[PDB]
């Protein structure tokens, strides 16, 4: 289920990954090579990943994308994608983002998790994933497509790491028996202005299914979830453009509120 060659792989993760550090896109890689599977462009991803370790990054969670039943029936995918998160991509609540450093980002408001035991697949669900979760933490995800175009190509999207860029964890954090993640009410507002409202349940209808299904789509790899690792669940809101100038708070039921200065 592979149609990439290794040296292809190296090269596109390496492209592609160069279209972050130099802020510069690219044409999505499967108009090039179109046969590529999910499976090469995890191939690319975990080469980017590689590729960020070596150089010394430490990676510091995973986010997840499509975490929409809708949108995924739109892309003909029957399960999110993930990504992995970067130390470097971490902005403390009420900092700075510098968009000179970013292409055309967007934020999308989540919901975090911390899980406190591992967990696996496959055949993991919500039962498995309650048990497992530490904590949860008010998300706002700065994402970034790498690419120049305007239609969401699922498999491109993978290689391109989800279009991960930044993230800005913040509000207060809460166990599980504190918030019901499905009713979170989460309301983003940028430059004093209301501009999405959405709850918890707009991931997937319940957040911690994300949990699940992350670790269903990591061991197809052989992979799972270790106990402290730290998941962005999934965007609650519809996502929205961000430049320079732009001040966003976004508030979260219960939780407090995330923001982010733009520059
Ligand atoms: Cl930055
Ligand atoms: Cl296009």
């Not at 970013?102 to 498995?128: F, M, N, Q, R």
């Not at 993978?158 to 954090?173: C, E, K, L, P, Q």
Request: glycine share 10%.
């Amino acid at each position: 289920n592979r149609t990439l060659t290794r040296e292809q792989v190296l090269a596109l993760a390496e492209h592609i990954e160069n279209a972050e550090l130099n802020v510069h896109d690219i044409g999505k890689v499967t108009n090039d090579f179109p046969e590529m599977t999910f499976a090469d462009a995890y191939d690319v991803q975990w080469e980017i990943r590689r590729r960020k370790e070596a150089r010394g990054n430490k990676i510091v969670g995973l986010k997840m994308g499509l975490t929409s039943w809708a949108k995924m029936a739109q892309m003909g995918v029957e399960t999110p994608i993930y990504g992995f998160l970067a130390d470097y991509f971490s902005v403390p609540d009420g900092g700075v983002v510098d968009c000179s450093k970013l292409i055309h980002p967007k934020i999308e408001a989540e919901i975090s998790v911390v899980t406190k035991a591992p967990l696996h697949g496959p055949g993991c669900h919500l039962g498995d994933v309650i048990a497992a979760i530490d904590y949860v933490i008010p998300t706002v995800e700065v994402i970034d497509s790498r690419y120049e175009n305007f239609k969401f190509d699922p498999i491109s999207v993978v290689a391109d790491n989800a279009s991960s860029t930044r993230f800005i964890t913040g509000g207060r954090m809460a166990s599980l028996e504190e918030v019901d993640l499905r009713t979170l009410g989460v309301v983003m507002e940028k430059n004093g202005e209301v501009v999405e409202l959405g709850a918890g349940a707009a991931v997937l209808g319940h957040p911690l299914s994300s949990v699940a299904m992350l670790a269903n789509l990591l061991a197809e790899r052989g992979e799972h979830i270790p106990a402290g690792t730290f998941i962005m669940t999934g965007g609650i809101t519809a996502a929205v453009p961000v430049a320079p100038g732009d001040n966003i708070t976004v508030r979260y039921q219960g939780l407090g509120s995330v923001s982010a200065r733009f520059i």
